[PDB]
């Protein structure tokens, strides 16, 4: 099981306090906050985002 | 303690007027004209001049 650490290891630089300092809590946070974006983005962002465009027109 | 505290928990410690007033306050002072040493008011030396007339 490969946590893609070197793909997240340099991106904790924009998390907040405890996540940046320690690694096994830093990854766990981002590899979740990343794991929910790319799940929010595929199935949920449109049917929200395409409702601002409908509420506008 | 059933949890460790992130800094934002340790940092709230430093906002109340209990931390500030205990550690982070500068004392008001002035130069004892007789001893030329810094001094607070209401306190004097063990010395005749400092003890007869409070500098």
């Amino acid at each position: 099981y490969y946590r893609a650490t070197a793909e997240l290891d340099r991106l904790r630089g924009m998390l907040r306090g405890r996540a940046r300092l320690e690694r096994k809590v830093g990854l766990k946070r981002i590899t979740f906050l990343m794991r929910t974006q790319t799940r929010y983005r595929v199935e949920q962002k449109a049917h929200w985002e395409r409702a601002i465009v409908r509420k506008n027109v | 303690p059933k949890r460790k505290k992130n800094p934002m928990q340790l940092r709230r410690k430093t906002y109340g007027l209990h931390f500030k007033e205990r550690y982070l306050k500068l004392e008001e002072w002035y130069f004892c004209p007789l001893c030329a040493e810094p001094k607070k008011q209401g306190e004097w030396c063990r010395r005749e001049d400092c003890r007869q007339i409070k500098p």
């Binding site: - | 209401g42 004097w44 030396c45 063990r46 005749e48």
Partner: protein, 257 residues
């Protein structure tokens, strides 16, 4: 209402008025009594500085009064000072009255008899015209290094009307603790009552030996066994008093020669 709102007994606080109310209990709210073992934060009680027991506190009230009389200044610390100055205004209230009731009511209280022999002689002469506030409570500045207890300098009032401490200086303590205190040079021409300065060197005589210079050497081993930082080894604690410091004083007793 008809009964007191707070019945017979309840401790109000430090910083609270008397709020007199009909009650069976007895409260002084006045402390004109001399040399009294009424220590407390109330009104009719002098401040109870901390100690192991109201007995041991009374034992601290003895060696801190008999050392203010012995040498007119004692650098006392914390809530002992407001508790001592009221014992310096009592000793004079005991030394002024004079009757052989009082001279014992202080004899019961002082660890040493020469003090009750002193207090009754200088103080009637000294404070013949002062009628209250005989002790001056001037606070030293640097809080103790061993704890933040404050250090007040309680000294008896006017000494220029004294007979024992006429023109002494207290800007600094005696060099070896058995050496008499430095004198103001403007009044260097002062001699003392003999019974005061002949009994002193009787006491100061034991530290001028070598058996105390062994108890001095030794003590520095205790404070290291108990490890106390910054205590020189008993191998470089060369004596306080010595033969070179002998020659001056036997020739400083030229009066009896």
């Amino acid at each position: 209402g008809r009964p007191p709102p707070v019945m017979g007994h309840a401790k109000r606080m430090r910083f609270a008025g008397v709020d007199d109310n009909p009650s069976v209990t007895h409260k002084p709210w006045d402390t004109s009594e001399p040399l009294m073992a009424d220590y407390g934060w109330e009104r009719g009680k002098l401040p109870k500085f901390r100690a192991r027991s109201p007995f041991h506190r009374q034992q601290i009230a003895r060696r801190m009064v008999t050392e203010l009389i012995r040498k007119d200044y004692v650098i006392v610390g914390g809530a002992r000072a407001p508790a001592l100055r009221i014992l310096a205004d009592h000793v004079v209230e005991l030394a002024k009255a004079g009757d052989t009731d009082s001279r014992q009511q202080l004899a019961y209280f002082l660890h040493d008899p020469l003090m009750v022999d002193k207090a009754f002689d200088e103080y009637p002469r000294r404070f013949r015209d002062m009628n209250a506030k005989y002790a001056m409570m001037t606070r030293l500045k640097g809080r103790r290094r061993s704890d933040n207890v404050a250090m007040y300098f309680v000294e008896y009032k006017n000494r220029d009307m004294s007979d024992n401490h006429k023109g002494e200086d207290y800007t600094a303590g005696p060099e070896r603790f058995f050496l008499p205190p430095r004198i103001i040079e403007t009044e260097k021409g002062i001699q003392r009552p003999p019974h005061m300065q002949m009994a002193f060197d009787r006491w100061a005589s034991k530290f001028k030996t070598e058996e105390f210079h062994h108890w001095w050497r030794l003590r520095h081993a205790k404070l290291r066994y108990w490890g106390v930082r910054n205590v020189p080894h008993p191998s470089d604690v060369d004596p306080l008093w010595t033969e070179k410091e002998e020659e001056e004083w036997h020739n400083e007793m030229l009066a009896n020669t």
